[PDB]
């Protein structure tokens, strides 16, 4: 709710693999499919 708690949890030792798989799976969704 507060910026202190967010910058805690963002820089905590939990979001490491979360940011890694976030970037990895969103880049994994970059391959465009077509519908024609």
């Amino acid at each position: 709710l507060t910026e202190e708690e967010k910058q805690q949890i963002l820089h905590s030792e939990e979001f490491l693999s979360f940011f890694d798989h976030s970037t990895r799976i969103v880049e994994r969704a970059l391959s465009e499919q077509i519908n024609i």
Partner: protein, 93 residues
Amino acid sequence: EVEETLKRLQSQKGVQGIIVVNTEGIPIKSTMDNPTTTQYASLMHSFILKARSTVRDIDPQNDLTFLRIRSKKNEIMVAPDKDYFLIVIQNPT
């Protein structure tokens, strides 16, 4: 680098906003109109709960990884992890 992630993945076209919601439903990551998209974040929080209930009740051992949705006007995905979740909305570009 999270803002670098924001820039690099919002530079990907079609995307109107990287609005990523947590497990708490709190807008830990929002770049668009927040009273509009916080309702939708709470919705897709409840429906990520629906999808995780779907996975863990249809199958004992299965784990929900990722979701693909084609709407009428755009192409929206959902990226769940074991602890926290993701939402982003993209157009056919």
